[PDB]
From a paper:
In A. tumefaciens, the recognition and import of opines is conferred by periplasmic binding proteins (PBPs) and their associated ATP-binding cassette (ABC) transporters; but there is no known structure of the opine-PBP complex. In this work, we investigated the structural and biochemical properties of the PBP NocT of A. tumefaciens C58 which senses at least two opines: nopaline and pyronopaline, a lactam nopaline-derivative that can also be found in plant tumours. NocT possesses a typical fold of cluster F within the PBP structural classification. The ligand-binding site of NocT was defined by the Glu36, Tyr39, Tyr42, Trp77, Ala94, Ala95, Gly97, Arg102, Thr115, Met117, Gln165, Thr168, Ser169, His170, Ser207, Gly238 and Val239 residues.
To learn more on the role of Met117 residue in the interaction between NocT and its ligand, we constructed two NocT mutants with different short polar residues: NocT-M117N because an asparagine is found in the OccJ sequence and NocT-M117S because a serine is found in the LAO/HisJ sequences. Both mutants displayed a similar KD for pyronopaline that was 76-fold higher than that of the WT protein, proving that Met117 is a key component of the ligand affinity and belongs to the nopaline-binding signature. We also obtained the structure of NocT-M117N in complex with pyronopaline. Prior to this, the stability of NocT-M117N was verified using differential scanning calorimetry (DSC) and, compared to the WT protein, the mutant presented similar Tm (60.12°C versus 60.25°C for the WT) and ΔH (1.59 105 cal/mol/°C versus 1.4 105 cal/mol/°C for the WT), meaning that mutating M117 has no significant effect on protein stability. The structure of NocT-M117N in complex with pyronopaline confirmed that the replacement of Met117 with Asn led to a loss of hydrophobic interaction with the ligand and showed that His170 which is free to move towards Asn117 bound the carboxyl group of the α-KG of the pyronopaline in a position not observed in the WT complexes. A loss of the polar interaction between the side chain of Ser169 and the terminal OH of the pyronopaline ring was also observed due to steric hindrance.
Residue numbers in the entry: 28 to 281
Amino acid sequence: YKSITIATEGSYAPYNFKDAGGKLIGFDIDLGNDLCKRMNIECKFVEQAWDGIIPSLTAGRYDAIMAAMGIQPAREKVIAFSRPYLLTPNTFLTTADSPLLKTQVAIENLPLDNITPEQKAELDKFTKIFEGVKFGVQAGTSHEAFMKQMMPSVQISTYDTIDNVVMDLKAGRIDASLASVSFLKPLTDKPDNKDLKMFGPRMTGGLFGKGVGVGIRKEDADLKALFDKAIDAAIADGTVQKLSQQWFGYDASP
Ligand SMILES: N=C(N)NCCC[C@@H](C(=O)O)N1C(=O)CC[C@@H]1C(=O)O
């Protein structure tokens, strides 16, 4: 390889978004550039809407995806992934005045790989509390899949971008949402968002898979091996931890 094009969304701060000059910035951009430097590959980042991000990769419009993409089992049927470059659980979001905040959480860290009767009872409790609660999630995500598969009785609205979900939550058009802690913690840490709060179990596994990875075509085994070697090196030397603290305000490195 000499040069690659990496697609990102540009609507998921602080992983990938746009600066004042309209340039793509974020953890995914800084990490992508760092990995390409380690691989000795010229790096170009391109903006791509979420709906076509995977088919544009398999159609050969670009070489890789770095766009806060969970290493999701359903996506693994279509594309390959690098080893994880970030780890995160997933949790709920509501307003600071919501009565949902008073809900007791019985299972703080809830793994979904092998749901026990105890874990199912906790999911069922939140499903019942969510009756009559209007949820909003980003379309085409594991958050949409979790609500449709694990909480089908809950009213759900899907949105083109997470920015429109947050806008409708602030406006009172929806009552709650679901996204990763890596997205929600920096969002709720902003003084701009003192009126928003994370709540509920912090979920991992199951349909979410494990970690965030670089999406790569299945046939590009050499490119995956190059990314995996570079990611291992960037974790080992503290680069992923450094960039995670810079963008997220905490260490989400594997
Ligand atoms: N708009 C974007 N560029 N990405 C949205 C990814 C949302 C979701 C996913 O992959 O479907 N995520 C998870 O399931 C774990 C990590 C990731 C997230 O919410 O940060």
